[PDB]
Scaffold this motif. Structure first.
Motif, PDB file in Angstrom:
ATOM      1  N   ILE A 133     -10.562  -9.205   3.321  1.00 16.06           N
ATOM      2  CA  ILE A 133      -9.319  -8.482   3.085  1.00 16.06           C
ATOM      3  C   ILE A 133      -8.637  -8.145   4.407  1.00 16.06           C
ATOM      4  O   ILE A 133      -9.275  -7.782   5.397  1.00 16.06           O
ATOM      5  CB  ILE A 133      -9.562  -7.207   2.254  1.00 16.06           C
ATOM      6  CG1 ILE A 133     -10.505  -6.261   2.985  1.00 16.06           C
ATOM      7  CG2 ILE A 133     -10.149  -7.554   0.891  1.00 16.06           C
ATOM      8  CD1 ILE A 133     -11.035  -5.164   2.115  1.00 16.06           C
ATOM      9  N   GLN A 134      -7.315  -8.258   4.407  1.00 13.71           N
ATOM     10  CA  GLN A 134      -6.504  -7.883   5.554  1.00 13.71           C
ATOM     11  C   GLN A 134      -5.124  -7.536   5.022  1.00 13.71           C
ATOM     12  O   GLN A 134      -4.384  -8.418   4.579  1.00 13.71           O
ATOM     13  CB  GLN A 134      -6.449  -9.014   6.576  1.00 13.71           C
ATOM     14  CG  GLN A 134      -5.793  -8.622   7.897  1.00 13.71           C
ATOM     15  CD  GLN A 134      -6.766  -8.026   8.884  1.00 13.71           C
ATOM     16  OE1 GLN A 134      -7.711  -8.688   9.317  1.00 13.71           O
ATOM     17  NE2 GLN A 134      -6.540  -6.773   9.253  1.00 13.71           N
ATOM     18  N   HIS A 135      -4.781  -6.260   5.056  1.00 14.72           N
ATOM     19  CA  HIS A 135      -3.560  -5.792   4.430  1.00 14.72           C
ATOM     20  C   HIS A 135      -3.318  -4.413   5.002  1.00 14.72           C
ATOM     21  O   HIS A 135      -4.294  -3.691   5.245  1.00 14.72           O
ATOM     22  CB  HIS A 135      -3.699  -5.723   2.903  1.00 14.72           C
ATOM     23  CG  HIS A 135      -2.456  -5.269   2.205  1.00 14.72           C
ATOM     24  ND1 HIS A 135      -2.151  -3.936   2.034  1.00 14.72           N
ATOM     25  CD2 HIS A 135      -1.429  -5.966   1.654  1.00 14.72           C
ATOM     26  CE1 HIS A 135      -0.990  -3.828   1.409  1.00 14.72           C
ATOM     27  NE2 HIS A 135      -0.538  -5.047   1.152  1.00 14.72           N
ATOM     28  N   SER A 146      -4.926  -9.473  -6.533  1.00 14.44           N
ATOM     29  CA  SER A 146      -4.511 -10.856  -6.277  1.00 14.44           C
ATOM     30  C   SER A 146      -5.677 -11.705  -5.799  1.00 14.44           C
ATOM     31  O   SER A 146      -5.713 -12.915  -6.055  1.00 14.44           O
ATOM     32  CB  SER A 146      -3.382 -10.913  -5.225  1.00 14.44           C
ATOM     33  OG  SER A 146      -2.235 -10.252  -5.689  1.00 14.44           O
ATOM     34  N   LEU A 147      -6.622 -11.098  -5.089  1.00 17.58           N
ATOM     35  CA  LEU A 147      -7.861 -11.746  -4.675  1.00 17.58           C
ATOM     36  C   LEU A 147      -8.985 -11.614  -5.712  1.00 17.58           C
ATOM     37  O   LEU A 147     -10.127 -11.999  -5.421  1.00 17.58           O
ATOM     38  CB  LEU A 147      -8.327 -11.158  -3.334  1.00 17.58           C
ATOM     39  CG  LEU A 147      -7.371 -11.375  -2.155  1.00 17.58           C
ATOM     40  CD1 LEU A 147      -7.922 -10.719  -0.887  1.00 17.58           C
ATOM     41  CD2 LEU A 147      -7.171 -12.861  -1.967  1.00 17.58           C
ATOM     42  N   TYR A 189      -2.588  -4.154  -5.454  1.00 16.79           N
ATOM     43  CA  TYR A 189      -2.022  -5.453  -5.825  1.00 16.79           C
ATOM     44  C   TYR A 189      -2.585  -6.565  -4.956  1.00 16.79           C
ATOM     45  O   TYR A 189      -2.921  -7.643  -5.456  1.00 16.79           O
ATOM     46  CB  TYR A 189      -0.501  -5.413  -5.724  1.00 16.79           C
ATOM     47  CG  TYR A 189       0.187  -6.722  -6.049  1.00 16.79           C
ATOM     48  CD1 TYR A 189       0.321  -7.134  -7.356  1.00 16.79           C
ATOM     49  CD2 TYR A 189       0.731  -7.521  -5.055  1.00 16.79           C
ATOM     50  CE1 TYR A 189       0.961  -8.301  -7.676  1.00 16.79           C
ATOM     51  CE2 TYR A 189       1.380  -8.716  -5.371  1.00 16.79           C
ATOM     52  CZ  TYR A 189       1.495  -9.086  -6.694  1.00 16.79           C
ATOM     53  OH  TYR A 189       2.126 -10.250  -7.060  1.00 16.79           O
ATOM     54  N   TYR A 190      -2.711  -6.318  -3.653  1.00 20.47           N
ATOM     55  CA  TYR A 190      -3.380  -7.275  -2.783  1.00 20.47           C
ATOM     56  C   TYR A 190      -4.815  -7.529  -3.242  1.00 20.47           C
ATOM     57  O   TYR A 190      -5.231  -8.685  -3.390  1.00 20.47           O
ATOM     58  CB  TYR A 190      -3.348  -6.760  -1.331  1.00 20.47           C
ATOM     59  CG  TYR A 190      -4.096  -7.645  -0.364  1.00 20.47           C
ATOM     60  CD1 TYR A 190      -3.489  -8.763   0.212  1.00 20.47           C
ATOM     61  CD2 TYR A 190      -5.388  -7.336   0.021  1.00 20.47           C
ATOM     62  CE1 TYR A 190      -4.179  -9.573   1.130  1.00 20.47           C
ATOM     63  CE2 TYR A 190      -6.077  -8.132   0.908  1.00 20.47           C
ATOM     64  CZ  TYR A 190      -5.481  -9.244   1.455  1.00 20.47           C
ATOM     65  OH  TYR A 190      -6.219 -10.004   2.322  1.00 20.47           O
ATOM     66  N   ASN A 206       0.550  -1.163  -3.720  1.00 19.18           N
ATOM     67  CA  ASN A 206       0.609  -2.346  -2.863  1.00 19.18           C
ATOM     68  C   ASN A 206      -0.785  -2.775  -2.425  1.00 19.18           C
ATOM     69  O   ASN A 206      -1.095  -3.974  -2.407  1.00 19.18           O
ATOM     70  CB  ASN A 206       1.491  -2.096  -1.612  1.00 19.18           C
ATOM     71  CG  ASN A 206       2.999  -2.068  -1.929  1.00 19.18           C
ATOM     72  OD1 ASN A 206       3.436  -2.591  -2.942  1.00 19.18           O
ATOM     73  ND2 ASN A 206       3.782  -1.424  -1.063  1.00 19.18           N
ATOM     74  N   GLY A 207      -1.627  -1.823  -2.015  1.00 20.69           N
ATOM     75  CA  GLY A 207      -2.974  -2.198  -1.602  1.00 20.69           C
ATOM     76  C   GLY A 207      -3.788  -2.756  -2.765  1.00 20.69           C
ATOM     77  O   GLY A 207      -4.533  -3.721  -2.606  1.00 20.69           O
ATOM     78  N   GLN A 237       0.518  -5.673 -11.657  1.00 26.52           N
ATOM     79  CA  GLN A 237       1.832  -6.298 -11.547  1.00 26.52           C
ATOM     80  C   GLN A 237       2.859  -5.552 -12.375  1.00 26.52           C
ATOM     81  O   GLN A 237       3.988  -5.331 -11.923  1.00 26.52           O
ATOM     82  CB  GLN A 237       1.774  -7.758 -11.989  1.00 26.52           C
ATOM     83  CG  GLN A 237       0.836  -8.632 -11.194  1.00 26.52           C
ATOM     84  CD  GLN A 237      -0.528  -8.796 -11.849  1.00 26.52           C
ATOM     85  OE1 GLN A 237      -1.033  -7.895 -12.524  1.00 26.52           O
ATOM     86  NE2 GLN A 237      -1.126  -9.966 -11.659  1.00 26.52           N
TER      87      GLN A 237
END
Ligand SMILES: [Cl-]
Ligand SMILES: [Cl-]
Ligand SMILES: [Cl-]
Ligand SMILES: [Cl-]
Ligand SMILES: [Cl-]
Length: 299
Positions: free
Chosen positions: A68-70, A129-130, A125-126, A122-123, A264
């Motif tokens: 993870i990188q966000h 998504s993974l 959602y990232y 936002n975090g 989402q």
């Protein structure tokens, strides 16, 4: 993992927190001067020992952290291991808990609350998504990088319970915090990304009211409240709250995970992204403030 002495490369210092079988300390890397948080995780080492964490659970947390990188998720710098501990050198997040920072303010509107909530969304959602479920989302795991700046940045921390969900559900018992776990965790049912969305509903409920929606008078009562989805928008705490906010929460606190709002959909919900100005102005209503946090802490 690096099989060297962490003390050869870092100076360690003040303890920042500690649960069972983990302690987090401030540290400074000798070669760069940069500061980090070092999380020492006690290995159980032998399968029959009860004095630590399974080295396989540790491996799971590290493999997720490496992926993870966000900007709203904590970053992993390095991993060491000795005979007793696995040591995660983590991004240092020093601004304290989001809710502690919010407890210091006299007033907070729903609009202001969404600016922070949106960073959590936002975090998450990232992560989703993974296909990563965090499984331990709760106020203590929502930290601030720097509490002084005009727009503070949220960091989601503590990936100790996080799992990759490649089959759409995992069948594992999760020992989370009763106030924040989804009914499928309480009932030892299969678990998915949807469980995080439930926790976001609970965090949002507290974010607007200062009250915990399923908190009972005993631990088992709290778990029963969760399983029965027994909560109320008590007018003592939600007198000002907009219908859009209550709808956002209502769509997350849903027993059936397949009927729960997805990450989402939550980002497209009109409370988060208003479609007209009538919706947008309804977010001028009062969220949590300093007196609501203390009114519920009085129990
Ligand atoms: Cl606290
Ligand atoms: Cl851990
Ligand atoms: Cl089953
Ligand atoms: Cl209700
Ligand atoms: Cl849905």
């Amino acid at each position: 993992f690096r099989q060297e002495n962490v003390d050869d490369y870092y100076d360690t210092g003040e303890e920042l927190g500690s649960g069972q079988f983990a302690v987090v300390k401030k540290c400074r890397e000798k070669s760069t001067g940069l500061q980090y948080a070092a999380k020492f995780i006690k290995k159980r080492r032998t399968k029959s020992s009860r004095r630590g964490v399974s080295r396989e659970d540790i491996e799971r947390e590290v493999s997720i952290l490496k992926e993870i990188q966000h900007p709203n998720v904590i970053t992993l710098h390095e991993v060491y291991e000795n005979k007793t501990d696995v040591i995660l050198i983590l991004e240092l997040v020093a601004g304290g808990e989001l809710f502690d920072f919010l407890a210091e303010k006299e007033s907070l509107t729903e609009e202001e609350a969404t600016e922070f909530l949106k960073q959590i969304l936002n975090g998450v959602y990232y992560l989703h998504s993974l296909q990563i479920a965090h499984f331990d989302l709760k106020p203590e795991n929502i930290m601030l990088l720097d509490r002084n700046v005009p727009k503070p940045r949220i960091k989601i921390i503590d990936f100790g319970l996080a799992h990759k969900i490649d089959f759409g559900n995992e069948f594992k018992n999760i020992f989370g915090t009763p106030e924040f776990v989804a009914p499928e965790i309480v009932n030892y049912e299969p678990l998915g990304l949807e469980a995080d969305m439930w926790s976001i509903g609970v965090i949002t409920y507290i974010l607007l009211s200062g009250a915990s929606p399923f908190l009972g008078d005993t631990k088992q009562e709290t778990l029963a409240n969760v399983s029965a989805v027994n909560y109320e928008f008590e007018d003592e705490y939600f007198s000002n709250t907009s219908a859009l906010a209550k709808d956002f929460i209502r769509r997350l606190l849903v027993k059936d995970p397949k009927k729960r709002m997805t990450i989402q959909d939550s980002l497209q919900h009109p409370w988060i992204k208003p479609k007209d100005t009538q919706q947008a102005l309804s977010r001028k209503a009062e969220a949590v403030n300093m007196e609501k946090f203390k009114k519920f802490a009085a129990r």
